[PDB]
Design an enzyme around this catalytic site. Sequence first.
Site, PDB file in Angstrom:
ATOM      1  N   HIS A 177       0.816  -1.011   0.138  1.00 30.38           N
ATOM      2  CA  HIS A 177      -0.211   0.066  -0.419  1.00 30.38           C
ATOM      3  C   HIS A 177       0.545   1.221  -0.140  1.00 30.38           C
ATOM      4  O   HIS A 177       1.963   1.045   0.145  1.00 30.38           O
ATOM      5  CB  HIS A 177      -0.973  -0.185   1.475  1.00 30.38           C
ATOM      6  CG  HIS A 177      -0.363  -0.009   2.416  1.00 30.38           C
ATOM      7  ND1 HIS A 177       0.040  -1.404   2.982  1.00 30.38           N
ATOM      8  CD2 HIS A 177      -0.377   1.153   3.741  1.00 30.38           C
ATOM      9  CE1 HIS A 177       0.355  -1.378   4.261  1.00 30.38           C
ATOM     10  NE2 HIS A 177       0.630   0.190   4.617  1.00 30.38           N
TER      11      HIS A 177
ATOM     12  N   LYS B 203      -1.985  -7.886  -4.207  1.00 29.66           N
ATOM     13  CA  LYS B 203      -2.868  -6.904  -3.273  1.00 29.66           C
ATOM     14  C   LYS B 203      -1.827  -5.525  -3.905  1.00 29.66           C
ATOM     15  O   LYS B 203      -1.247  -5.944  -3.190  1.00 29.66           O
ATOM     16  CB  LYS B 203      -3.424  -7.272  -2.361  1.00 29.66           C
ATOM     17  CG  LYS B 203      -4.523  -5.601  -2.292  1.00 29.66           C
ATOM     18  CD  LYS B 203      -5.214  -6.324  -0.618  1.00 29.66           C
ATOM     19  CE  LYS B 203      -6.060  -4.853  -0.374  1.00 29.66           C
ATOM     20  NZ  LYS B 203      -6.353  -4.965   1.172  1.00 29.66           N
TER      21      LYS B 203
HETATM   22  C1  3DS Z   1      -7.240  -4.092   1.607  1.00 27.48           C
HETATM   23  C2  3DS Z   1      -7.538  -2.654   0.600  1.00 27.48           C
HETATM   24  C3  3DS Z   1      -8.478  -1.547   1.191  1.00 27.48           C
HETATM   25  C4  3DS Z   1      -9.359  -1.141   0.295  1.00 27.48           C
HETATM   26  O1  3DS Z   1      -8.387   0.230  -0.074  1.00 27.48           O
HETATM   27  O2  3DS Z   1     -10.430  -1.953   0.585  1.00 27.48           O
HETATM   28  C5  3DS Z   1      -9.240  -1.943   2.703  1.00 27.48           C
HETATM   29  C6  3DS Z   1      -8.004  -3.231   3.758  1.00 27.48           C
HETATM   30  O3  3DS Z   1      -8.361  -3.735   4.805  1.00 27.48           O
HETATM   31  C7  3DS Z   1      -7.500  -3.889   2.913  1.00 27.48           C
HETATM   32  O4  3DS Z   1      -6.225  -5.045   3.336  1.00 27.48           O
END
Ligand code: 3DS
Lengths: 245, 247
Positions: free
Chosen positions: A137, A164
């Site tokens: 992220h 992801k």
């Molecule tokens: C992954 C991604 C998320 C999002 O951007 O919707 C929510 C988060 O809880 C997940 O780990």
Amino acid sequence: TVTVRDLVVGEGAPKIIVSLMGKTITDVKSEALAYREADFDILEWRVDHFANVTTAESVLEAAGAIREIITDKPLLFTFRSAEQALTTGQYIDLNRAAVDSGLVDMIDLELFTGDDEVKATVGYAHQHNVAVIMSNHDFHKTPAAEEIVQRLRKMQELGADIPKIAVMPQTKADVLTLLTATVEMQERYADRPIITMSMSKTGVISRLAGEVFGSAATFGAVKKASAPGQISVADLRTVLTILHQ
Amino acid sequence: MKTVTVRDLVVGEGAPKIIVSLMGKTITDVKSEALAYREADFDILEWRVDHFANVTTAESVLEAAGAIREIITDKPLLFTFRSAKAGGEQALTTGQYIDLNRAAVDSGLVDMIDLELFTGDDEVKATVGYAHQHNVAVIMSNHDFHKTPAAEEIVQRLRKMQELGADIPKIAVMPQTKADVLTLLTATVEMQERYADRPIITMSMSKTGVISRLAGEVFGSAATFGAVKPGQISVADLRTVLTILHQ
Ligand SMILES: *[C@H]1C=C(C(=O)O)C[C@@H](O)[C@@H]1O
Ligand SMILES: O=C(O)C1=CC(=O)[C@@H](O)[C@H](O)C1
Ligand SMILES: [Cl-]
């Protein structure tokens, strides 16, 4: 595709994931109970919001509580690193505990944790028949398309069942960059499903357009979002269904 | 922030506007379609007059325009002869096409006309002045049914439409790939943000481009097409999604 329980991920319309965020076992139980009729496919437990996260017995106890209430949907165990910080050692053992509990169908492991630790932890999961969402992220900006693509490939390279990536746009063009990387990854390099999203209200289309651009699951919110840009689960199902026609 | 008001509708603000097209061959068909569509939730009625068999008979065109306006009394009416070059149904010379549009302006029965980008610059400029004199707005359009030009070429076209006087520049392009849909979105954002002093309408055609019909509030397209009903997205579904995205 990746089959978890009786759910096939990476086929048909994208699957919906919702996050459970309770602080205490009481909150976790009341949230799970409330989510039980909501229309979603995978339940994500966001253990990082759980106050007793450093107590093994407590975490195990809370996983059972969730499982007892949500008995059909796949359960995803996620400690997203930001409130209670943990050491790498704590993070790994926590995930190992989760895997060995039998209470979870999938775990989330962050890409920048450490290669050996990740491959080690990935191996352990699969031998216990637990799928691994490998994640990354950026809550402040959007990396260049080729960097996003590099990170997704690195996650495949480490054994992820579902790479992801979630990034934050600062311009509308940044939402398009995330989609560009999704298309490129999925069409050229992916041999497994992937999950991508551009956060915030500006990036919502990235939560909706997975079937055409290649993201296989998307998060929605029941009452409180787990990330900016999530729309209600009902609204999300409504749009995915229209887009699948 | 750039808007055009047609009839009582403000294009360019809020959620993108839904356009539906009337495609009937005869006056009877036109009337039937208008009555059927009044049962749907759209914003702008486009009359695809190229489908109208008696298009070269002025009195017939005026009768049909009147009939439509009797039925659809609230909503703006856009008059659009799609040329045969663009795969419209019938051929008109440039002079005939300009005359057809001037007659739609003079009728007082239409709120907007469509003029194609490559019609002929001098005649377009004259026609736009004529339309403006009668408080008729001009959508200028361009279609590429074969491919998606580069983003900067799409931007270039949109800019030329503004230069020619368009109230609303409109472009529709055909994706051959998924990246092509994103190219059209990129051109929409660059145009809106850097060069537009008017609302614009942009679309990536086909199933593959349907997200371009849904995401205009964020990306910059002021209107979208749906069908009242196999084929393109329905007005009901389009409204459902536009409403969600406006929240
Ligand atoms: C992954 C991604 C998320 C999002 O951007 O919707 C929510 C988060 O809880 C997940 O780990
Ligand atoms: O620009 C247009 O008139 C249209 C283009 C399309 O691709 C059609 O689906 C739409 O209903 C009408
Ligand atoms: Cl043209």
